[PDB]
């Protein structure tokens, strides 16, 4: 595996989805704020490309509408596609619940 896609130094969240939404989307923006992640710290990538990341990558991620877990070390939050998340309140509460389970990865104590 010669050529690979490297995660920028300032990126702290990899967002994966078939359809990459706009980081300024109302719902996406609130989820990023919930994760205490600024949009500038986000790397958006379609499911493909995850296979192009260097073996040994470590970054938290949030995937939408993609059941198969990423081959990327880190806290992995998963939710339905954005379309479905936006219309399912239950799905949103579940996403938060999932985020809380990983509080140590997103809301480190200090």
């Amino acid at each position: 595996g010669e050529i690979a896609i490297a995660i920028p130094a300032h990126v702290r969240l990899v967002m994966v989805a078939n359809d990459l939404p706009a980081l300024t989307d109302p719902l996406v923006s609130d989820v990023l704020r919930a994760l205490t992640v600024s949009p500038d710290q986000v790397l958006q990538l379609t499911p493909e490309k995850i296979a192009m990341l260097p073996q040994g990558s470590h970054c938290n991620s949030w995937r939408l509408g993609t059941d198969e877990p990423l081959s990327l070390e880190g806290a992995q939050v998963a939710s339905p596609a954005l379309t479905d998340l936006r219309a399912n309140p239950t799905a949103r509460a579940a996403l938060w619940q999932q985020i809380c389970t990983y509080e140590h990865d997103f809301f480190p104590r200090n």
């Binding site: 719902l27 989820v31 936006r86 309140p89 949103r92 938060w96 985020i99 809380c100 509080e103 104590r109």
Partner: protein, 147 residues
């Protein structure tokens, strides 16, 4: 300074089991959180708390407002915590949205408090009593309409 704001409602329309006040609470809590504040919603009863805990995942529309009932959520509590009299809350909070019928002493610990003047005439006197109480407690008072 302590600042208390009383939002004056112009209707008492109930939607999905939510009073006009509780509906406005969802809007206010979301806007304050989004502005970077840690919010405490002090409900008069446990049952009201569960009503808002559910309501906040549906409204405001197209929003994701991270919240939990007082004793749940992440350490230090969720950004938006919903409590009731029989349940101690998380510290380190910037704004209090109180649904208490009478002046609550734990309100004095806050720099920012939001209270309401319901539409139904039968509740306006309680609201007036609360107003005077904030005045006595040293809060800077002001009324407003939400838009």
């Amino acid at each position: 300074m302590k600042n208390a704001t009383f939002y004056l409602l112009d209707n008492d329309t109930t939607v999905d089991g939510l009073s006009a006040v509780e509906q406005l609470v969802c809007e206010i809590a979301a806007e304050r959180w989004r502005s970077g504040k840690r919010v405490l919603i002090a409900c008069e009863d446990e049952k009201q708390a569960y009503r808002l805990d559910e309501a906040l995942w549906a409204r405001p529309a197209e929003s994701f407002v991270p919240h939990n009932l007082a004793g749940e959520g992440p350490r230090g509590g969720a950004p938006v915590e919903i409590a009731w009299p029989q349940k101690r809350s998380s510290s380190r909070r910037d704004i209090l949205i109180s649904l208490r019928t009478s002046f609550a002493d734990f309100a004095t610990a806050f720099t920012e408090v939001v209270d309401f003047v319901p539409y139904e005439d039968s509740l306006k006197q309680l609201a007036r009593e609360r107003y005077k109480a904030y005045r006595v407690a040293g809060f800077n008072l002001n009324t407003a309409t939400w838009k």
